[PDB]
Write a protein that binds this DNA or RNA. Structure first.
Ligand code: HMT
Ligand code: CL
Ligand code: CL
Ligand code: CL
Ligand code: CL
Ligand code: CL
Ligand code: CL
Ligand code: CL
Ligand code: K
Ligand code: MG
Ligand code: MG
Ligand code: MG
Ligand code: MG
Ligand code: MG
Ligand code: MG
Ligand code: MG
Ligand code: MG
Ligand code: MG
Ligand code: MG
Ligand code: MG
Ligand code: MG
Ligand code: MG
Ligand code: MG
Ligand code: MG
Ligand code: MG
Ligand code: MG
Ligand code: MG
Ligand code: MG
Ligand code: MG
Ligand code: MG
Ligand code: NA
Ligand code: NA
Ligand code: NA
Ligand code: NA
Ligand code: NA
Ligand code: NA
Ligand code: NA
Ligand code: NA
Ligand code: NA
Ligand code: NA
Ligand code: NA
Ligand code: NA
Ligand code: NA
Ligand code: NA
Ligand code: NA
Ligand code: NA
Ligand code: NA
Ligand code: NA
Ligand code: NA
Ligand code: NA
Ligand code: NA
Ligand code: NA
Ligand code: NA
Ligand code: NA
Ligand code: NA
Ligand code: SR
Ligand code: SR
Ligand code: SR
Ligand code: SR
Ligand code: SR
Ligand code: SR
Ligand code: SR
Ligand code: SR
Ligand code: SR
Ligand code: SR
Ligand code: SR
Ligand code: SR
Ligand code: SR
Ligand code: SR
Ligand code: SR
Ligand code: SR
Ligand code: SR
Ligand code: SR
Ligand code: SR
Ligand code: SR
Ligand code: SR
Ligand code: SR
Ligand code: SR
Ligand code: SR
Ligand code: SR
Ligand code: SR
Ligand code: SR
Lengths: 142, 172, 337, 160
RNA sequence: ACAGCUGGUUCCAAUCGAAACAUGUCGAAGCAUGACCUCCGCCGAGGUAGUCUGUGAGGUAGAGCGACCGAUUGGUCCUGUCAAACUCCAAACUUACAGACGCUGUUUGACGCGGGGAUUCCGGUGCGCGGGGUAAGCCUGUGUACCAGGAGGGGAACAACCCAGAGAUAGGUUAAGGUCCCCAAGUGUGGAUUAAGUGUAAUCCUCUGAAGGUGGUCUCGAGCCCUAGACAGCCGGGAGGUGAGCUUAGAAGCAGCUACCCUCUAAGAAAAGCGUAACAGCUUACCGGCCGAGGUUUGAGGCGCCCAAAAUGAUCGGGACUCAAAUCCACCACCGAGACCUGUCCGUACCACUCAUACUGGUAAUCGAGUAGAUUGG
RNA sequence: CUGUCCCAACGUUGGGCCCGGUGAACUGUACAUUCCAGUGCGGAGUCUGGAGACACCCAGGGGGAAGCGAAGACCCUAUGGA
RNA sequence: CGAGUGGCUUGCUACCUCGAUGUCGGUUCCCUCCAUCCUGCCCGUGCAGAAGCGGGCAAGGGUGAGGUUGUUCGCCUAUUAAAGGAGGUCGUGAGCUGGGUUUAGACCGUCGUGAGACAGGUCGGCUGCUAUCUACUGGGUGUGUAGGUGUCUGACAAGA
RNA sequence: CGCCACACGGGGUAAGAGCUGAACGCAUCUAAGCUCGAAACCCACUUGGAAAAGAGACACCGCCGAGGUCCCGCGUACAAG
């Protein structure tokens, strides 16, 4: 379905938390943001420990529940929510005006935000969001 | 640092991104050489491995990249050969190459055949009691050779009395 | 130090609530192997009888001898594959694309559906083929219904509609195989999918028991000895420890038991026939008389008599198929007595 | 008893034997080891074991560390070898234990400990040049049996 | 009925503002008398919370002991250790009196004296110094500041940790703390380290992490070797007198004992390590070649790694962060209290005028928080 | 000897459940959809951080409200009683 | 000898509750921990084999029936792959039991002049409440998404 | 107390076994890279699941009528619903 975005961000080879922090800041300023190519988004560090943290979040829960997303679609969306006061009116409106996508459903190419890009030629210790999702058990639909 | 490797006349090598393809008369080997701030490029007749950093970790990998490229040069010309001998004490071991995998039958009296798959374009030739693992990619040949020795691994009983198996005789 | 003991009942068939559809819905389908074909069929539970059979198993010490085997008689009349639905591979999973319907419909199908008067079977077929060219086509399934009118013992005439997958060859050849079944009138029999001696998975919505306690529902103990006379007979010890200060959903409690969907794996089809060969004297209790297309399933089948059971080729068989078992005798003795 | 109960200098100096009775004898058999007839200045190499943290070392630990150090020197250099080791610290601090709850809590006398300040020499061995690596090993075994981390410092020896 | 025991005791405001300690007590869940709080009257010029100097008092820290005393080593003077109830020594510091400066007092009367009224005599915590105890969110001292009875800002929350002591209202600038998002302010600058998500945790019952170990990595120093070719690797040589002598059936580098000598030479042990019954065999020493640039030994520092096991769901507050949003060295600009500055107003105190304690004018950097309680106007 | 147990089943009567009629009491500082951790006078639905959470109703067995009921009968204390 | 981790034992403290947070053991039902008894995969061996001994990863599943004793603990028997340990207010009395501790009756031994006592033994000796909130197991009614019928998808969730 | 059914296999790892390989010409399972390898993890399989607030998809029927409720005879259902 259509979503009229003011800003379209390209998450490809970009440090997740840094994109997320900027997308949150913009959503609270009234912008309708759309994060694109989230499967190709990046997160630094040793893969074994990163996956361990995300696997623990999946195993955590009870009857009240702890719904933790396995797909890179929802993982990026949850990362943004943690940077937004989603329980408050202004915060929920900001969050609901942000959507994360697998690939690029638009004709326009996304913009790469400043300070978010990771130089692959300078880094080897990082993981792609899709690689985390495959290890978590999600169905590769990208 | 910067280390220049002169390409042999028999060999001609192309490169795209982080992958280096090395072609010759014995075959073609493509390898991915990726490490922080180490640029591997082809400067006409030489392969250049350079970096702006000179730390212990960077130096470790520059030297590893050198040996990998020099090995690819040797692989596409002279090739890589590992020689193996099959030893048996009581039970006659039947080693055969059935398809793209080398099968070992009647090992130590087993009814079920032990088998391992051959890695890449590696060729395993058998002449009775002698086996010769050969090919251009040292990674593929070294493993296929090792896989054959590892296939007859025995953990349950004493290896000193039960010495049956195919062992590596010649290392290149 | 107080003996260990496995928990009471399984946690994998939950929540133990009433089923949404009385018509079972398969959550898995067989793998695409040889020739194209519909991956399932459906019937109506009749009752039980026994069969004397010749041992087919080559590894049995009794190979060739007479063995008595329990059998559930299920009436399996021809069904109608009225449409061909196609799915497309979207980044959110499989979503339905379009459906290719027919012209020829059963007289009493309008009891369930709003039967198509104006449809374009060619534009639908075109949309599916443009998707196959694009490499976006997922799987091909058929909208199918039963003809309860053909079964005199089942009171209903209102057809039970369900979707069934077509698997087998290439995506191009099974699209064509599917369109051929549909465009004729959709008529297919148990023979078209199954052969006697094959392993099938029977899905059914169980016998409803209303509300029952922990002893029946979860298999917990009754209060023993002195504890049985104090005012508590069929109630569990406690609802949980002091901490956590809440009742965990894993504790055996009262509620709805029965009328749940179960998919019973690896059921041998002893025989597929037609006629009155498996009918019991005086008729099957609470059902009636069988005189038409039937199937004989080895052992028990979920659900009561008159209920719609579903068939599918076994997704996980343990044994190799031993086709067409020699049936020496089928019991026709009264189930009353 | 663990050293965790006595390793710190947290109580006053309790040494006065004219006011304290029933003090257990020292487990330390020797203080002067090796060749006690020869001088310390007759040796070219002088290596000491220096304590890094300010502690209280019990007579049982002193005997254990001295025994495991001198036993190595007796093993490698012989029973009458050319060396001389000295344990310069003596167990002066008398130790108590409250072994009734916290009432009349002043404990009975259970042992003795040596108060060694940080940077001080606990052991000092005088050997020749060829026996230097055998004494560094005797001290490596000796530091594992006392409470603090230690330095094996060479005081007289530019022979490396 | 009595109770030293529990509960309750009803309107507003203004000034001051504790004690949880000492002595006695069939006293310790209570009283009395002091300390301390408050109110009134008297007196009439000094006072002394700080500092400096002068004239005195002191034996704690430290230190030391052929300076006493008592502990406490060994050797044929020398050599090894200690002290709450030791001292030939000896602080910092505390303390008496005086002078000087400071501050304060003579309409706000200080210092002091007399009288009325109390409350209070379960305290707590931080820091410094303690004593007991394995320890304790332990017990019991002491000095001090605080909570109690102290708001507001910060610290995730949180009596006593940090800033800060506070009339109302208003503008401004800072403090502690913070500036990637949640969240106001930097995805700031110069440089370096870390790859463990170490860390993003001042203090702490609360934030662990140890002895021991670490060619993980970075940085600094020292000695020695090297283009007359070092370190390593690979090739070649590793030879004879003689298989040394003694011992022994034998022992021939290599069971043991002793010696450990000289030729050839560019080296080659009377043999460093395996091996054999003994030989043989494999190499080590040592020498030469190929090769070609630094190498090797030791010391110190920085960050990290191992050591590292717990019970419903993991965590730096969370998200998350890697040339950082970590750590260390510097630096730049900001955000951020009721603090500080500033306009107006209020109360209280004092001054001038006044019968007034009614107006009016003036002063307060040196007035404005408060439980028990004293005092006063409504 | 036997359903005390293995190991539970089916049945019988009265309730239970729905409908008409009759019609109490216990209990109630307030707020209250909670869960996991943390913090706090060290045993929190309410504080902190997160997680979860559309409202109302029916039946249930009682995990929690350190549930309700009784100014602890134990223990100590009182210049108490018997 | 030295360094630690845990918070199952015991001890210490006296912070919390004396206008009451129901005491042991057992039972029943649920979750968890790993310092692993078995089971899977491994390393060493004084590893021929077989059977073992020791060690590593690993908590998915399992770890049972009985004789004395109120017992926890423990001793004992026969089975077993093994018949591991521990936390959840020493989980669990608005669930059960009530054999032990610990009222009022009584006896014995010891102590006491005596009343009477005992960290001695012994026989007997009670178990309240109609669920407001919350929690969960199942069942409905509405509203939201915005005419209807039928078929599905799958974010998440549970499993041994 | 009777009867029927309840895998294999993939993928990634731990301990471990190795390959290629440098720092350190050699050596080295590791530093980059790679082949394997647990009843454990993920998938496979079963059950729930449009209230997933991004509140979904498809086909047909219908908006003056499709469909639903009430009603009636009953259970493959059921404490009311
Ligand atoms: C000496 O033991 C007793 O006295 C039991 C009882 O009397 C039980 C009272 C039960 C009531 C009457 C309140 O229902 C009682 O008041 O117990 C207190 C009591 O009553 C509320 C609870 C206490 C208070 C701390 C928690 N604990 C639980 C029960 C208990 C058990 C004890 C105990 C004390 C407590 C107290 O001594 C050792 O065994
Ligand atoms: Cl959950
Ligand atoms: Cl919020
Ligand atoms: Cl990297
Ligand atoms: Cl019971
Ligand atoms: Cl103040
Ligand atoms: Cl992390
Ligand atoms: Cl007034
Ligand atoms: K109490
Ligand atoms: Mg064996
Ligand atoms: Mg019958
Ligand atoms: Mg009969
Ligand atoms: Mg007043
Ligand atoms: Mg006033
Ligand atoms: Mg001193
Ligand atoms: Mg007070
Ligand atoms: Mg901001
Ligand atoms: Mg950490
Ligand atoms: Mg009372
Ligand atoms: Mg009494
Ligand atoms: Mg009396
Ligand atoms: Mg209770
Ligand atoms: Mg372990
Ligand atoms: Mg488990
Ligand atoms: Mg208990
Ligand atoms: Mg209970
Ligand atoms: Mg009770
Ligand atoms: Mg009750
Ligand atoms: Mg009894
Ligand atoms: Mg009794
Ligand atoms: Na990370
Ligand atoms: Na989760
Ligand atoms: Na009862
Ligand atoms: Na309880
Ligand atoms: Na006493
Ligand atoms: Na009285
Ligand atoms: Na007193
Ligand atoms: Na009193
Ligand atoms: Na003066
Ligand atoms: Na001092
Ligand atoms: Na007092
Ligand atoms: Na104060
Ligand atoms: Na605060
Ligand atoms: Na971390
Ligand atoms: Na007051
Ligand atoms: Na009965
Ligand atoms: Na309850
Ligand atoms: Na500990
Ligand atoms: Na109990
Ligand atoms: Na396990
Ligand atoms: Na027993
Ligand atoms: Na309790
Ligand atoms: Na009871
Ligand atoms: Na009990
Ligand atoms: Na596997
Ligand atoms: Sr931003
Ligand atoms: Sr289906
Ligand atoms: Sr499904
Ligand atoms: Sr009863
Ligand atoms: Sr609780
Ligand atoms: Sr002390
Ligand atoms: Sr030590
Ligand atoms: Sr003093
Ligand atoms: Sr920055
Ligand atoms: Sr910087
Ligand atoms: Sr705590
Ligand atoms: Sr250390
Ligand atoms: Sr005021
Ligand atoms: Sr005031
Ligand atoms: Sr009830
Ligand atoms: Sr009473
Ligand atoms: Sr573990
Ligand atoms: Sr085992
Ligand atoms: Sr016990
Ligand atoms: Sr016992
Ligand atoms: Sr338990
Ligand atoms: Sr007893
Ligand atoms: Sr007794
Ligand atoms: Sr009793
Ligand atoms: Sr609404
Ligand atoms: Sr490995
Ligand atoms: Sr919907």
């Amino acid at each position: 379905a259509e979503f009229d975005a003011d800003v379209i961000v390209d998450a490809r080879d970009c440090i997740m938390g840094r994109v997320a922090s900027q997308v949150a800041e913009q959503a609270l300023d009234g912008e309708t943001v759309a994060v694109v190519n989230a499967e190709r988004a990046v997160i630094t560090g040793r893969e074994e420990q990163i996956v361990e943290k995300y696997e623990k979040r999946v195993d955590i829960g009870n009857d009240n529940g702890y719904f933790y997303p396995k797909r890179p679609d929802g993982i990026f969306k949850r990362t943004i929510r943690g940077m937004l006061p989603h329980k408050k009116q202004r915060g929920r409106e900001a969050f609901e005006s942000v959507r994360v996508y697998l690939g690029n459903p638009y004709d326009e190419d996304g913009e790469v935000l400043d300070g978010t890009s990771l130089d692959r030629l300078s880094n080897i210790k990082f993981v792609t969001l899709g690689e985390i999702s495959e290890t978590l058990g999600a169905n590769k639909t990208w | 640092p910067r280390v220049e490797l002169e390409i042999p006349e028999d060999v001609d090598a192309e490169q795209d991104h982080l992958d280096i393809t090395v072609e010759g008369d014995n075959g073609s080997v493509t390898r991915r050489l990726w490490y922080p701030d180490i640029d591997v490029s082809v400067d006409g007749d030489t392969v250049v491995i350079e970096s702006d950093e000179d730390n212990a970790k960077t130096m470790s990998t520059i030297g590893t990249f050198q040996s990998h490229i020099e090995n690819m040069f040797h692989g596409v010309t002279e090739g890589w050969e590992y020689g193996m001998e099959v030893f048996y004490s009581h039970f006659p071991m039947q080693v055969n190459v059935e398809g793209d995998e080398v099968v070992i039958e009647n090992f130590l009296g087993e009814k079920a055949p032990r088998r391992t798959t051959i890695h890449g374009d590696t060729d395993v030739e058998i002449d009775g009691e002698e086996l010769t693992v050969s090919g251009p990619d040292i990674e593929a040949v070294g493993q296929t050779a090792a896989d054959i020795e590892q296939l007859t691994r025995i953990n349950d009983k004493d290896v000193r009395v039960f010495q049956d198996g195919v062992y590596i005789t010649r290392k290149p | 130090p107080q003996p260990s003991r496995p928990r009471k009942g399984s946690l994998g068939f939950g929540p133990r609530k009433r089923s949404t559809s009385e018509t079972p819905r398969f959550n898995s389908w067989p793998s695409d192997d040889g020739q194209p074909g519909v991956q399932g069929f459906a019937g109506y539970k009749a009752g039980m009888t026994h069969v004397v059979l010749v041992n087919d198993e080559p590894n049995s010490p009794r190979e060739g001898m007479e063995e008595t085997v329990p059998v559930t008689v299920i009436e399996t009349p021809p069904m109608r594959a009225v449409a061909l639905r196609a799915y497309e591979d979207t980044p959110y999973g499989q979503r339905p694309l379009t459906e290719v319907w027919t012209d020829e419909f059963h007289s009493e199908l309008d009891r369930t559906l709003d039967v198509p008067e104006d449809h374009d079977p060619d534009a639908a077929e075109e949309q599916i083929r443009d998707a196959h060219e694009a490499g976006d086509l997922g799987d091909l399934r058929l909208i199918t219904h039963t003809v309860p009118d053909a079964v005199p013992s089942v009171p209903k005439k209102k057809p039970d509609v369900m979707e069934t997958r077509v698997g087998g060859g290439s995506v191009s050849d099974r699209l064509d195989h599917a369109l051929d079944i549909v465009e004729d009138g959709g008529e297919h029999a148990m023979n078209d999918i199954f052969r006697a001696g094959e392993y099938a998975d029977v899905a059914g919505v169980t016998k409803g028991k209303g509300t029952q306690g922990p002893v029946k529902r979860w298999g917990v103990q009754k209060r023993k000895g002195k504890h049985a006379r104090q005012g508590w007979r069929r109630r569990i010890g406690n609802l949980g420890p002091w901490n956590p200060s809440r009742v965990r959903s894993t504790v055996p409690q009262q509620g709805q038991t029965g009328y749940h969907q179960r998919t019973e794996l690896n059921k041998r089809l002893i025989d597929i026939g037609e006629g009155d060969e498996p009918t019991v004297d005086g008729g099957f209790v609470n059902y009636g008389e069988v005189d038409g297309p039937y199937t004989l399933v080895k052992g028990s089948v979920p659900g009561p008599d008159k209920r719609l059971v579903r068939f599918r080729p076994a997704v996980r068989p343990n044994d190799q198929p031993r086709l067409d078992p020699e049936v020496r005798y089928v019991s026709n003795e009264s189930n009353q007595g | 008893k663990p050293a965790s109960m006595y390793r710190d200098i947290d109580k006053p100096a309790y040494t006065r034997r004219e006011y304290i009775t029933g003090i257990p004898g020292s487990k330390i058999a020797q203080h002067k080891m090796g060749r006690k007839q020869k001088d310390a200045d007759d040796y070219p190499v002088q290596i000491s074991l220096i304590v890094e943290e300010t502690v209280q070392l019990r007579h049982g630990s002193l005997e254990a560390s001295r025994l495991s150090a001198n036993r190595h020197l007796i093993k490698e250099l012989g029973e009458e070898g050319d060396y001389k080791m000295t344990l310069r610290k003596f167990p002066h601090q008398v130790l108590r234990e409250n072994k009734d709850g916290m009432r009349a809590a002043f404990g009975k006398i259970v042992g003795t400990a040596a108060r060694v300040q940080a940077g001080e020499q606990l052991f000092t061995a005088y050997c020749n040049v060829e026996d230097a690596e055998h004494v560094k090993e005797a001290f490596r075994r000796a530091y594992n049996k006392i409470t603090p981390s230690c330095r094996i410092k060479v005081e007289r020896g530019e022979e490396l």
